[PDB]
Amino acid sequence: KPLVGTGMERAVAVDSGVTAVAKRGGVVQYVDASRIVIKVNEDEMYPGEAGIDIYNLTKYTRSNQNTCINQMPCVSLGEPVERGDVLADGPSTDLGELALGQNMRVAFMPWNGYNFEDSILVSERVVQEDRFTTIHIQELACVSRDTKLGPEEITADIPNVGEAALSKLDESGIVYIGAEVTGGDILVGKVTPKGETQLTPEEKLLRAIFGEKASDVKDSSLRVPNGVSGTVIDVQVFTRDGVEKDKRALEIEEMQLKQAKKDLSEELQILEAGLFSRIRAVLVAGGVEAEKLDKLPRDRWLELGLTDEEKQNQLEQLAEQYDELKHEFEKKLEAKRRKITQGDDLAPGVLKIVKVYLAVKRRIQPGDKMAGRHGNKGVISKINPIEDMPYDENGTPVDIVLNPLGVPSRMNIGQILETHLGMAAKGIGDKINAMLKQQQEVAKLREFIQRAYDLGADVRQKVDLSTFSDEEVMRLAENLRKGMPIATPVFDGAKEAEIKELLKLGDLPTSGQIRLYDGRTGEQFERPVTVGYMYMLKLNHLVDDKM
């Protein structure tokens, strides 16, 4: 999250299309890493088409810039949600906010030259926590073209390749899903480059091998190059119609038939469960049967004792909806078997296209580019150990040591106010963590959170915790214990005296500067230095893409 934001994060997150905004509010029924089921409240609900919504999230798939556009569910089970609200966070989002990079403990001091021009010096505590470890996905395609002497072969029947290459391949050439490969293995086997080779005297004896007339055409299996690791997460096989499907392509066809069969059957089951819950909700009154309702099978909940009212009309409308779902499920499963079973129109003269998705995990190293949000760029220059970092008289090492000299020339003085206000935010977060780790009752937490939320001039927020009812305050403090987020709008922001008064609420020093010891010598730096939290971003100008 950003500790020091502008409150504009929710507009950019919700008003884009990476999060899964709820359409009709209600009660969550089933959360999963794949899907989310909302049961729609009755004061938002259509009379017909009984209705409980299913959000199919978009799991690990390729973006355009080879990032990893993921969606994670952020709601619990049994949880109420309102209309116009986030259910699943997207890439670089958190609880509906917008979290681009991560917020880290920064100090402005010259440290032994390793941050000379604009460079950045980062502790190993950052790379141990796996906190810039971005996930990239590369798509590798392989087409089966149509040339002379005949078409190509994708099968693993190949000579030369030792029983070391082919251990990572399926009996039918394609690498199976999950095989963690290196740079330069074989993903798809394709015997194709077939040239010419002589066989005179010495090699004429080599023509009298296994009776084979001559080994002229160069036996050779299309092997791939190096530079990248990865883990094969997804394999697609497209077949131009008429061509024989091999055993793997029939495996993928059975797999997707099974997935789509299960998915449409669960659509029918889940919407039928919502429809039967509607029938139970209608039959609470007007000819209710408390014991007789569950003696008979559940598909006949219509011929029970009830006159011509709105309720028998509603059961007839739900029978119309149910028979519509039955015949619709029949025709849609037939159409989906048609879509899976059919071929695809493709390039002129291609047999089949195999696409393989490698999923590299690139961590951080000397040479990547990090930057804050004010123009303070920099190539990270040395990934120090934990011990060498300047620590303070509490014990905590600083994570990143910037360079102070970039401030008076490159006039971005806003990063130092952002640093001081981030330290104020983390001071409030540390005091919440101290008041909660000691297992204190909710009264003292209510006191301190109320004092941290008033704190200012005539402002807009004006919250009070007296209408949160002793269980939300514990969960709000569970979310505030890693720091307290602070909005600062653009030209109407937090002045200096408000930052000072918030640094006085925590027990931090007023000037923002802590005296810091050294890690190497163990003796104090003179003239106490500026520490705080800056929200720094990793940019995708990495160093193992330029080298």
Partner: protein, 221 residues
């Protein structure tokens, strides 16, 4: 005739962290032994972290399992943060089986007796259906420092997490004046460590002093 440091008081003020005391010390040796033992304790102490995980129905670590509201990658991070003690065993294989709606805490691991979990309230993941169950094998071993996955798996079902074999978190010494001895100009070294429960504090200060006195063996008699 230098006064020699002897451990005097081990104030176990909470379950994670303690405050050992080196006393007494001639002037100058406070900062020397403080910085030295801090740097040894943060550098290289024997921890007991985790290396391999094999969830049952999971091929690669980027997949998703039917019936758990976190990805397999998030389960690997939550198992990477597992605080576990082993007793007289290079490596060990822990087994986890759990079925039913609710959390899968760290106390649901079938403990092999010698293996001792030090924080049993640690959440791993959340099962979220009536018949949807995880069943994994966890591999926990000794080590020293930070051994990532890129340096060091044979079937396709193993999952390699990074290995942070490091028990301590925050070592802070605070030198201060001594008055117990009538002689003045003596110092007390008070070291507040921050363990995750896998290492006794006197054992930590003893291993740090053994490592440093092993390093000075190159040019001592």
């Amino acid at each position: 005739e230098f006064l020699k440091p002897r451990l005097v008081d081990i104030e176990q003020v909470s379950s994670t962290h303690a405050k050992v005391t080196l006393e007494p010390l001639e002037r100058g040796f406070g900062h020397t032994l403080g910085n030295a033992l801090r740097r040894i304790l943060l550098s290289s102490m024997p921890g007991c972290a985790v290396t391999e995980v094999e969830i049952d129905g999971v091929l690669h670590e980027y997949s998703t399992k039917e019936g758990v509201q976190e990805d397999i990658l998030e389960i690997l991070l939550n198992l990477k943060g597992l605080a576990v003690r082993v007793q007289g065993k290079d490596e060990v294989i822990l087994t986890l089986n759990k079925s039913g709606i609710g959390p899968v805490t760290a106390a649901d691991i079938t403990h092999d007796g010698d293996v001792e979990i030090v924080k049993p309230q640690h959440v791993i993941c959340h099962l979220t259906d009536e018949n949807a169950s995880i069943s994994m094998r966890i591999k926990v071993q000794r080590g020293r420092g930070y051994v990532p996955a890129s340096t060091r798996e044979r079937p396709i079902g193993r999952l390699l997490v990074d290995a942070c074999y490091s028990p301590v978190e925050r070592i802070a010494y605070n030198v201060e004046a001594a008055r117990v001895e009538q002689r003045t100009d003596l110092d007390k070294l008070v070291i507040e460590m921050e363990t995750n429960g896998t290492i006794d504090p006197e054992e930590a200060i003893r291993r740090a002093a053994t490592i440093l006195a092993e390093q000075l063996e190159a040019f001592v008699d």
